[PDB]
């Protein structure tokens, strides 16, 4: 029953212990505006302040700064819960609060419906499924790269038996206003291709010019043109550029426009362009099980398309690779020392046999309460093995 | 920008609104709907203890005195109280596990004089433990403290 209760009892790394702090991420669609996003961050701050004012101390929201994306389109919300004390029942604890909220922001026009806890141990929450990377190992492009990503995300979305929640990472692919200078039609007009660009760039992108001292501190001087004159396509024309001859020339005179497509977040993995795919194991299956499949589904993909694993799936882990080898030794050296002061080869068996007795309680208790098989349980298991041998030893010893 | 024919002049002011603005207006934040700014600090690989935060509230320490009217530091998000309350609520665990033992000790060999031996032996060893510890680099951690009691 010990082995049974042991294979039954599931495993993890470390417990999400409520840290009187946590944060919710906000993410709007493509081409969304700072205003639009801000409507979202507002609907978010309202909740914590109204329908949860009892637990939430303060919200710190930032519009235009995600864990990626960046710019008017993403938002973050650092929450600071009230004192630990003033938050009794599990009801007022982080897991609950974040839960309620996740379900809360669910009813909103934009997928931000999130909030969560601090992955047990900062930066070290690399145990939440897997990380998949698709590489463009041939001359292919963003066209075929992603075009084989939708095709992979399908094959995996189809059978949620060994794979759950397979998606990409904010690649989107929003439109782009493509302006095309008609070089000659301009070179001919008496206008340098240079004055043209710096004018198009200085006006719509900004230009870091010189520096200046502002109250005994050096700061920058920027040139960019008022907002009203760069909010809409047509506005492109309003801009005039000097000509050799001496007279201005509108942009519309030497350039055409047209909406095209691009990606606000081109990415790469080891030099080659790439696309990151995240996802969860599967309800009752370990990373490995979920992965062998992911490697197969890719094989189908077009030629050139390839893959690799990054952080949170670059290694193989504890119970299932580590412990089953070191655990060997621990009780492998046990049959040693237990001879260094016994000398029988057979007598050190007694003490050894105890081990299971304690492991049964530990597994028992473990299963009864929510508790899982993790580092601490592990830690505990060993010490439990020790104490066992302890008692046993003396009994056996005095006997001898 | 240019001296005009009719004797007049065209100044920058005449072709552009000029004001002190941000270098970029992409990020803007609020602390409870109230406009605000802040410091999004991090760590340096294998950085130091809270010592980092210990010494973040070092620089800010003396900055507060020359602040103009209206500037009040506020602290949303903070890993500190954890460490503070993570410890406390362990050293207590360790103390209690002592009084606890002193009892079981008594309930078996009625003798405030004997029961006092294991009472003098446990602390001793723990002490000696942070010692051998430091000797190998390991620091008093919200993770090293467990194995202490365990």
């Amino acid at each position: 029953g010990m082995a049974y209760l042991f294979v039954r009892l599931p495993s993890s790394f470390l417990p999400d212990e409520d840290q009187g702090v946590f944060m919710t991420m906000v993410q709007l669609p493509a081409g969304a505006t700072q205003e639009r996003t801000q409507k979202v961050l507002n609907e978010v701050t309202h909740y914590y302040l109204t329908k949860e004012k009892n637990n939430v101390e303060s919200v710190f929201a930032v519009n235009g700064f995600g864990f990626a994306g960046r710019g008017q389109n993403t938002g973050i919300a650092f929450v600071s819960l009230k004192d630990w004390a003033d938050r009794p029942g599990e009801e007022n604890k982080v897991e609950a609060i974040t839960m309620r909220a996740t379900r809360a922001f669910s009813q909103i026009k934009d997928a931000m419906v999130f909030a969560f806890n601090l992955p047990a141990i900062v930066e070290l929450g690399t145990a939440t499924g897997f990380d998949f990377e698709l590489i463009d190992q041939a001359g292919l492009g963003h066209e075929k790269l992603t075009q084989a990503r939708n095709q992979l995300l399908a094959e995996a979305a189809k059978h949620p038996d060994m794979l759950t929640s397979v998606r990409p990472n904010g690649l989107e692919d929003t439109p782009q206003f493509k302006i095309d200078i008609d070089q000659e039609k301009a070179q001919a007009l008496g206008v340098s291709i240079n004055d043209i660009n710096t004018t198009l760039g200085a006006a719509w992108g900004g230009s870091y010019v010189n520096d200046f001292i502002d109250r005994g501190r050096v700061k920058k001087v920027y040139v960019m043109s008022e907002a009203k004159y760069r909010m809409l396509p047509d506005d492109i024309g309003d801009w005039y550029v000097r000509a050799a001859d001496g007279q201005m020339v509108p942009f519309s005179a030497f350039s055409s426009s047209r909406w095209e497509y691009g990606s606000p977040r081109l990415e790469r993995y080891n030099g080659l362009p790439s696309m990151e795919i995240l996802g969860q194991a599967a309800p009752g299956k370990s990373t490995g099980e979920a992965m062998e499949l992911m490697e197969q589904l890719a094989s189908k993909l077009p030629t050139g398309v390839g893959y690799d694993w990054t952080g949170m799936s670059y290694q193989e882990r504890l119970s299932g690779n580590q412990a089953p080898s070191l655990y060997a030794i621990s009780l492998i050296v046990v049959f040693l020392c237990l001879a260094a002061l016994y000398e029988s080869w057979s007598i050190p068996f007694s003490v050894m046999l105890v081990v299971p007795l304690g492991v049964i309680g530990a597994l028992l208790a473990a299963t009864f309460r929510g508790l899982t098989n993790d580092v601490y349980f592990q830690v505990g298991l060993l010490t439990t093995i020790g104490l066992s041998a302890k008692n046993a030893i003396l009994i056996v010893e005095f006997a001898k | 920008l240019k001296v005009n024919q009719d004797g007049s002049r065209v100044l920058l002011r005449d072709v552009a609104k000029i004001e002190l603005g941000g270098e970029n207006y992409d990020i803007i934040a609020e602390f409870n709907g109230q406009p605000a700014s802040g410091l999004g600090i991090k760590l340096a690989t294998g950085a130091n203890a809270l010592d980092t935060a210990a010494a973040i509230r070092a620089e800010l320490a003396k900055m507060e005195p020359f602040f103009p009217s209206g500037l009040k530091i506020v602290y949303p998000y903070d890993t500190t109280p954890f460490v503070k309350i993570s410890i406390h609520e362990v050293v207590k665990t360790l103390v209690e596990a002592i009084i606890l033992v002193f009892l079981v000790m008594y309930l078996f060999l009625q003798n405030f004089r004997a029961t006092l031996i294991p009472t003098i032996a446990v602390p001793v060893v723990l002490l000696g433990t942070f010692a051998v510890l430091a000797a190998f680099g390991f620091s008093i951690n919200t993770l090293t403290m467990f194995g202490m009691v365990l």
Partner: peptide
């Protein structure tokens, strides 16, 4: 909780058991 629980659980069933079996899988292991 994690720490302690398994620790206790295991410790009880390790005391009220090893106190009967040890005297046995020792004699037997002769």
């Amino acid at each position: 909780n994690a720490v302690g629980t398994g620790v206790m659980g295991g410790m009880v069933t390790a005391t009220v058991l090893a106190i009967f079996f040890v005297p046995v899988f020792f004699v037997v292991v002769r």
